[PDB]
Design an enzyme around this catalytic site. Structure first.
Site, PDB file in Angstrom:
ATOM      1  N   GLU A  43      -0.528  -0.632  -4.622  1.00 13.12           N
ATOM      2  CA  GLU A  43      -1.189   0.682  -4.830  1.00 13.12           C
ATOM      3  C   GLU A  43      -0.244   1.966  -4.798  1.00 13.12           C
ATOM      4  O   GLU A  43       0.284   2.070  -3.984  1.00 13.12           O
ATOM      5  CB  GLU A  43      -2.403   0.736  -3.572  1.00 13.12           C
ATOM      6  CG  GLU A  43      -3.245   2.167  -3.638  1.00 13.12           C
ATOM      7  CD  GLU A  43      -2.716   3.160  -2.669  1.00 13.12           C
ATOM      8  OE1 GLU A  43      -2.449   3.081  -1.668  1.00 13.12           O
ATOM      9  OE2 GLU A  43      -2.478   4.187  -3.440  1.00 13.12           O
ATOM     10  N   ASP A  97       0.792  -1.369  -0.122  1.00 14.03           N
ATOM     11  CA  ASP A  97       0.139  -0.006  -0.030  1.00 14.03           C
ATOM     12  C   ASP A  97       0.917   1.394  -0.041  1.00 14.03           C
ATOM     13  O   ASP A  97       2.267   1.025   0.352  1.00 14.03           O
ATOM     14  CB  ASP A  97      -0.966  -0.042   1.170  1.00 14.03           C
ATOM     15  CG  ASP A  97       0.027   0.344   2.589  1.00 14.03           C
ATOM     16  OD1 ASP A  97       0.913  -0.537   2.915  1.00 14.03           O
ATOM     17  OD2 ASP A  97      -0.409   1.353   3.180  1.00 14.03           O
TER      18      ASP A  97
END
Ligand SMILES: OC[C@H]1O[C@@H]2O[C@H]3[C@H](O)[C@@H](O)[C@@H](O[C@H]4[C@H](O)[C@@H](O)[C@@H](O[C@H]5[C@H](O)[C@@H](O)[C@@H](O[C@H]6[C@H](O)[C@@H](O)[C@@H](O[C@H]7[C@H](O)[C@@H](O)[C@@H](O[C@H]8[C@H](O)[C@@H](O)[C@@H](O[C@H]1[C@H](O)[C@H]2O)O[C@@H]8CO)O[C@@H]7CO)O[C@@H]6CO)O[C@@H]5CO)O[C@@H]4CO)O[C@@H]3CO
Ligand SMILES: OC[C@H]1O[C@@H]2O[C@H]3[C@H](O)[C@@H](O)[C@@H](O[C@H]4[C@H](O)[C@@H](O)[C@@H](O[C@H]5[C@H](O)[C@@H](O)[C@@H](O[C@H]6[C@H](O)[C@@H](O)[C@@H](O[C@H]7[C@H](O)[C@@H](O)[C@@H](O[C@H]8[C@H](O)[C@@H](O)[C@@H](O[C@H]1[C@H](O)[C@H]2O)O[C@@H]8CO)O[C@@H]7CO)O[C@@H]6CO)O[C@@H]5CO)O[C@@H]4CO)O[C@@H]3CO
EC number: 2.4.1.18
Length: 587
Positions: free
Chosen positions: A317, A278
């Protein structure tokens, strides 16, 4: 063995001639005094002194009698003269709340990744991910207690299998002190959280996922330097792991081995099939604003995993449209296999939020995704981040009275599962939870109690979408090849009707048509490529999902009537606020 420091550092069982004990090892080049304290010592910092190998940085000490089960720490005199107990950064299990002491347990056995699990990660596989926070999927009803890893093996694994998902994605399970971080603020990168049981219980859970035919993706956090409990800051008195607000010194070598080894650890010792990183922007930004150490670290890690554990994949991400996140390093790339399509999530949710009378003005929100689809290998994500902090649930974003909200939601899922890119859906989304995700409570399973209702209808649709998406090659085989997608009707803005084909390697086509207004469309004629008999294989307005049961009611033959520049056409019923998928019948 530079790649796998966890096999050496930390606490491991060893034999000294003929007496058994545990070899301890800690990397701290400065230090000047490290001793091993535990339950084998009465925590006596005198009793067991380590001895630095100044070549390496590692304090090492064997201890007879020391064995599996016992708690320990290290007693540290600083490079700067201070007395601190340090938890083992390579603790493979950590003591329960509160506390901190590391646990002697050693390494679990290596898991060999099977060909079937390698296959499930490939670009040409159907990939539908159920994203789960283990601490809040379910709770025991009478006491609100967490499910254990073992209870999750018995409940979550069969549920996700039944619902047709191919992968389970876990929010970070590394030990972390505060529930509210959701796992993203860790203290022990090598220890599975004790919230749900032992590290062997967690391994049991992963084995159960595998036995049910599910791959497991783990949210991995090499971008969040620990911030709690004095876990990793100023480890020997200097900036050991961190840079001179706290960030890893990825440029340093032992730090990078620590992080790359941690990836190898999850994959090889727990059988994890994929890792998701992330907040990649926070790693590689803030060469102008680019941290080159981090970018190199990411390229490195991805390269090494590709070498050491072929079959495992990484996904990222990244929120600043950095180029080539999921592209090879020998070009401009970061070397990830997949990237979350955040743009698609924002665009399509913005479109669904609109009063349907205004969708005519925002057709670009649905068509744009195709224009950049072939620049990254995308996962279409409806994730945990989108249903917290006042962003509402996905259901509550939909416009209209409740019956129209559910119809909108069904149509949108029909669209998402047909659009190029892999699928990810956060827990609760599949039964249209009304409330936002609360990490401190169970999901709202009560919505599914009683007589069959609109929530059950959504849950049945998501299952049918998964099973249909997996059965037909055209829906998933060429997500990343222009040959896998072709518009049939890209410019019906006035009516908010969009029609495309998905295509498999053999050239078979499935027609997907979506009608994003409450106006039913009858005798809607459009050009097609493969004349013959066509039949619905998915209809989000089916009474099976509490829709109105409108649709084509059987086989429809194409006509040799030209339409949209094509010589043959189909003339169909397109149900209001719905999407339908159609297959060609062989003759
Ligand atoms: O009568 C006691 C009890 O007996 C049975 O419970 C046993 C259980 O079957 C075993 O599993 C074992 O438990 C451990 C458990 O497995 C671990 O998870 C852990 O528990 C942690 C929770 O997981 C975690 O969520 C949190 O728990 C907090 C809750 O989230 C929060 O809601 C609140 O809890 C209160 C309850 O909401 C409330 O209902 C009330 O609880 C009473 C129950 O109503 C009643 O059924 C009974 O409990 C039974 C249980 O049903 C049997 O299965 O009496 C309860 C009176 O206390 O009050 C709760 C407040 O205490 O707060 C909690 C605590 O923070 O943290 C915990 C702690 O880590 O550890 C468990 C044990 O260490 O053993 C138990 C006990 O024998
Ligand atoms: O805001 C961006 C965009 O919005 C509007 O465009 C929409 C358009 O009005 C709709 O019709 C629909 O577009 C779909 C289209 O109808 C389909 O035919 C298909 O398109 C495929 C092409 O046929 C095919 O050629 C290929 O396209 C590739 C090109 O060959 C190649 O050149 C390159 O594209 C680059 C351009 O060359 C370059 O100019 C640059 O682009 C910008 C444009 O100049 C600018 O007009 C604007 O585009 C608007 C557009 O004006 C609106 O009408 O911004 C562009 C940058 O985003 O850079 C381009 C990309 O690097 O690469 C492409 C793609 O590989 O493949 C495509 C895709 O299969 O699909 C279309 C998408 O559904 O929707 C669009 C967008 O909503």
């Amino acid at each position: 063995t530079h790649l796998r420091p966890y096999e050496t550092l930390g606490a491991h069982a060893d034999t000294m001639d003929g007496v058994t004990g545990t070899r301890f090892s800690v990397w701290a080049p400065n230090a000047r005094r490290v001793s091993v304290v535990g339950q084998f010592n009465y925590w006596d910092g005198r009793r067991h002194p380590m001895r630095l190998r100044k070549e390496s940085g590692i304090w090492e000490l064997f201890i007879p009698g020391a064995h599996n089960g016992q708690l320990y720490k290290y007693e540290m005199i600083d490079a700067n003269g201070n007395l601190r107990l340090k938890s083992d950064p390579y603790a493979f299990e950590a003591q329960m709340r509160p506390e901190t002491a590391s646990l002697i347990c050693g390494l679990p056995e290596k898991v060999v990744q099977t060909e079937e699990r390698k296959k499930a990660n490939q670009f040409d596989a159907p990939i539908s991910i159920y994203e789960v926070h283990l601490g809040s999927w379910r709770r025991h009803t009478d006491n609100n207690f967490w499910l254990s890893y073992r209870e999750l093996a018995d409940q979550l694994v069969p549920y996700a299998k039944w619902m047709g998902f191919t992968h389970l994605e876990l929010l970070p399970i590394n030990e972390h002190p505060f529930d509210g971080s959701w796992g993203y603020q860790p203290t022990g990168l090598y220890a599975p959280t004790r919230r749900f049981g032992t590290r062997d219980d967690f391994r049991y859970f992963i084995d159960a996922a595998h036995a049910a035919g599910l791959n497991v993706i783990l949210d991995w956090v090499p971008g969040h330097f620990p911030t709690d409990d004095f876990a990793l800051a100023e480890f020997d008195g200097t900036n050991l792991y961190e840079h001179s607000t706290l960030i890893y010194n990825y440029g340093r070598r032992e730090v990078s081995n620590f992080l790359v080894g941690n990836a190898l650890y999850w994959i090889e010792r727990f059988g994890i099939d994929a890792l998701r990183v992330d907040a990649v922007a926070s790693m590689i930004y803030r060469g102008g604003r680019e941290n080159l150490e981090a970018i190199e670290f990411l390229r490195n890690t991805n390269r090494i995993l590709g070498e050491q554990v072929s079959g495992a994949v990484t996904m990222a991400e990244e929120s600043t449209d950095f180029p080539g996140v999921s592209r090879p390093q020998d070009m401009g790339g970061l070397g990830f296999w997949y990237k979350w399509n955040l743009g698609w999530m924002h665009d399509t949710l913005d479109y669904m939020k609109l009063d349907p009378v205004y969708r005519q003005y925002h057709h670009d929100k649905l068509t744009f995704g195709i224009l950049y689809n072939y620049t990254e290998n995308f996962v279409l994500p409806l994730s945990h981040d989108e249903v917290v902090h006042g962003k509402k649930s996905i259901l509550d974003r939909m416009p209209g009275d409740a019956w129209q909200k559910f119809a909108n939601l069904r149509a949108y899922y029909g669209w998402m599962w047909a659009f190029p890119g892999k699928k990810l859906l956060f827990m609760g989304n599949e039964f249209a939870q009304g409330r936002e995700w609360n990490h401190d409570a169970s999901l709202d399973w009560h919505l599914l109690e009683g007589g069959d209702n609109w929530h059950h209808g959504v849950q049945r649709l998501v299952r049918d979408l998964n099973l249909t998406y997996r059965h037909h090659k055209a829906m998933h085989e060429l997500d990343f090849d222009p040959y896998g997608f072709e518009w049939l009707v890209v410019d019906d803005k006035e009516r908010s009707v969009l029609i495309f084909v998905r295509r498999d390697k053999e050239g078979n086509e499935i027609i997907v048509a979506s009608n994003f207004t409450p106006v039913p469309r009858h005798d809607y004629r459009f050009g097609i490529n493969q004349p013959g008999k066509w039949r619905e294989i998915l209809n989000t307005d089916s009474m099976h999902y509490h829709g109105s049961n409108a649709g084509n009611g059987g086989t429809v033959h194409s006509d040799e009537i030209a339409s949209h520049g094509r010589q043959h056409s189909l003339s169909l019923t397109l149900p209001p606020l719905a999407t339908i998928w159609l297959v060609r019948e062989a003759e």
